[PDB]
Amino acid sequence: VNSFSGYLKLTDNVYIKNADIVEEAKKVKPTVVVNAANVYLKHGGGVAGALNKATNNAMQVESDDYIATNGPLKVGGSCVLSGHNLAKHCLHVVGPNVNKGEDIQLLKSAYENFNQHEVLLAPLLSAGIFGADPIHSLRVCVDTVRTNVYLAVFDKNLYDKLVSSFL
Ligand SMILES: c1ccc(CNc2ncnc3[nH]ccc23)nc1
């Protein structure tokens, strides 16, 4: 039993809710919140900008030190950093950004990072400003992640479409 509430169950291991991931993170304090990161960990907008704003920019400060030491992530890759006031840990995962021309096949590699964590609160990777079709992202999630994932979808309209079209 865990503390996630109001989720619709899609499969054995995937759950989905219309929620603001920031507000859900602050209420649940999950072990892991996933950030929709870019390779530079520049948290300017979308989910990343919102999560970073909620940390009062502490996420960005920590991220800049990470990049200065380690260099950029790979598209499809991830790193574990602090969850600050939102979670124990933040798993920064880089989905392909269609608006940069990145290969959508890398979306499966991105979701594979979730399998290193038993339970996660997450957004749909490569959705929103990353330009992928969220229905495709949900399909890849279900077909790739084997650990327990709680997906927060900010937009109520998209949430209803994802549920109604789910196979
Ligand atoms: C429109 C469609 C999809 C998204 C995906 N981005 C997010 N997904 C979950 N929670 C969020 N909070 C802020 C952003 C965010 N954004 C905007």
UniProtKB/Swiss-Prot annotation:
Notes on how activity is controlled: Inhibited in vitro by GRL-0617.
Q: Which organism is it from?
A: Severe acute respiratory syndrome coronavirus 2
Origin, by domain of life? Viruses
Give its localization.
Answer: Host endoplasmic reticulum membrane
UniProt subunit comment: May form homohexamers. Interacts with N protein.
Q: Which gene encodes it?
A: rep
Name used for this protein in its record: Papain-like protease nsp3
| Function summary | Responsible for the cleavages located at the N-terminus of the replicase polyprotein. Participates together with nsp4 in the assembly of virally-induced cytoplasmic double-membrane vesicles necessary for viral replication. Antagonizes innate immune induction of type I interferon by blocking the phosphorylation, dimerization and subsequent nuclear translocation of host IRF3. Also prevents host NF-kappa-B signaling. In addition, PL-PRO possesses a deubiquitinating/deISGylating activity and processes both 'Lys-48'- and 'Lys-63'-linked polyubiquitin chains from cellular substrates.
Q: Which reactions fall under this protein's catalytic activity? A: Thiol-dependent hydrolysis of ester, thioester, amide, peptide and isopeptide bonds formed by the C-terminal Gly of ubiquitin (a 76-residue protein attached to proteins as an intracellular targeting signal)
Which portion of the complete protein is shown here? 1025 to 1191 of 7096
Q: How does it sit in the membrane?
A: Multi-pass membrane protein
* Residue span, Macro domain: 1-167
Task: Please describe, based on the UniProt annotation, the reported consequence of changing residue 164 to L.
Answer: In strain: Gamma/P.1
